[PDB]
Amino acid sequence: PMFIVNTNVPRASVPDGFLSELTQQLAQATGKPPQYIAVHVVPDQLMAFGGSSEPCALCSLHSIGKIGGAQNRSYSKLLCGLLAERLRISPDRVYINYYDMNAANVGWNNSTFALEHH
Amino acid sequence: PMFIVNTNVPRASVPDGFLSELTQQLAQATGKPPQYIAVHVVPDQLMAFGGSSEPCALCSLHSIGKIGGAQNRSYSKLLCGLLAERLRISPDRVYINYYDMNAANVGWNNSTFA
Amino acid sequence: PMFIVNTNVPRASVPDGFLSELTQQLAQATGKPPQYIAVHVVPDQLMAFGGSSEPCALCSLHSIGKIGGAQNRSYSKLLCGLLAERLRISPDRVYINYYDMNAANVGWNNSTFALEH
Ligand SMILES: CC(C)c1cn2nc(O)ccc2n1
Numbered sequence: 001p002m003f004i005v006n007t008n009v010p011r012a013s014v015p016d017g018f019l020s021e022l023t024q025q026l027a028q029a030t031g032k033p034p035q036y037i038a039v040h041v042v043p044d045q046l047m048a049f050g051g052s053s054e055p056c057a058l059c060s061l062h063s064i065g066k067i068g069g070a071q072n073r074s075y076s077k078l079l080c081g082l083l084a085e086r087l088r089i090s091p092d093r094v095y096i097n098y099y100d101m102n103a104a105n106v107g108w109n110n111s112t113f114a115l116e117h118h
Numbered sequence: 119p120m121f122i123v124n125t126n127v128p129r130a131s132v133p134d135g136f137l138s139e140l141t142q143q144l145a146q147a148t149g150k151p152p153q154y155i156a157v158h159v160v161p162d163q164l165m166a167f168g169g170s171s172e173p174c175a176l177c178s179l180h181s182i183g184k185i186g187g188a189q190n191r192s193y194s195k196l197l198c199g200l201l202a203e204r205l206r207i208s209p210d211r212v213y214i215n216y217y218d219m220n221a222a223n224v225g226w227n228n229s230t231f232a
Numbered sequence: 233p234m235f236i237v238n239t240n241v242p243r244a245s246v247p248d249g250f251l252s253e254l255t256q257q258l259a260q261a262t263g264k265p266p267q268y269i270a271v272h273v274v275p276d277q278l279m280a281f282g283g284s285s286e287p288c289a290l291c292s293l294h295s296i297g298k299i300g301g302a303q304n305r306s307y308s309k310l311l312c313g314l315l316a317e318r319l320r321i322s323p324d325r326v327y328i329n330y331y332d333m334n335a336a337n338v339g340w341n342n343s344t345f346a347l348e349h
Binding site: 006045046047048049050051053056058059067068069072073075076077079080081091092094095096097098099100 | 122129132142152153157158160161225227228232
């Protein structure tokens with residue numbers, strides 16, 4: 001899985017260990033091994049949410065499976081919680097786009113995760 | 119709705135008011151209140167379009183619905199016009215990816231829109 | 233087509249000619265003329281892969297068509313090879329998300345690529 005956070009919060013406000021915490025929490029949430037979790041945080045961004053430049057975040061979570069109605073609600077509570085606690089961003093100023101990726105559409109290690117057919 | 123612009127145009131060339139203009143014009147075009155609109159502009163990027171480093175932009179617009187043939191052509195006219203006028207980027211050096219998001223696949227305020 | 237690379241490798245480590253090599257090799261790989269190809273490289277990123285901050289890359293390739301099982305495996309070999317050779321990133325610390333875009337969902341030059349209806 002891949003989690004990306006873009007925010008206008010300053011770099012200095014991103015706590016040390018934040019990427020590690022995201023990695024561990026996402027492994028737990030998705031049930032995927034931590035070795036396959038990638039995290040990316042992009043601070044100091046020029047953005048607005050509802051016309052306002054108060055702290056906000058635009059995020060995406062890509063996963064092969066483990067994406068869906070109830071699961072995404074669970075992910076949203078988890079991730080908004082982390083953004084609010086760690087970056088002090090209000091949950092109502094966060095968007096998270098979820099993407100259920102097909103294995104054949106994810107490249108890794110010179111190939112893709114579609115190793116079964118030709 | 120959510121609009122992202124990545125461009126190699128320098129930050130100093132982004133005019134005061136640009137995010138607000140994007141917010142207001144996208145609210146108008148999508149039929150959604152300005153409260154719903156998020157915008158994100160990323161200048162000074164290392165990019166090329168057609169192998170050239172002249173001004174260009176790679177963009178995305180995500181919306182729950184309001185995405186389709188005629189609507190997307192209308193968004194493109196609107197957004198290319200703004201990029202050309204405000205950032206001096208030629209329309210034929212802009213790509214915009216449109217995404218029609220399922221409400222269940224958009225998180226906000228501790229839940230999703232489903 | 234549009235190819236984006238986000239990486240924690242520093243800007244200074246991106247070699248002269250990298251954007252042009254990506255442009256040309258992607259034109260070759262997808263069978264599309266180079267005029268169509270857009271590339272975007274974002275260094276110095278705060279990212280981790282598998283809980284490690286060793287060099288890694290998160291990438292996307294968007295194309296109208298030319299996306300599929302065997303083709304994507306070919307793109308991955310090409311692109312991981314370039315990231316390994318040029319940026320010294322291990323292929324097993326690279327993810328590439330592939331997107332088969334509908335012509336109606338790609339804007340360009342004041343319109344889209346859906347010009348038929
Ligand atoms: C931010 C919040 C008021 C909000 C944003 N959106 N976007 C939609 O597309 C639909 C409902 C909605 N509520």
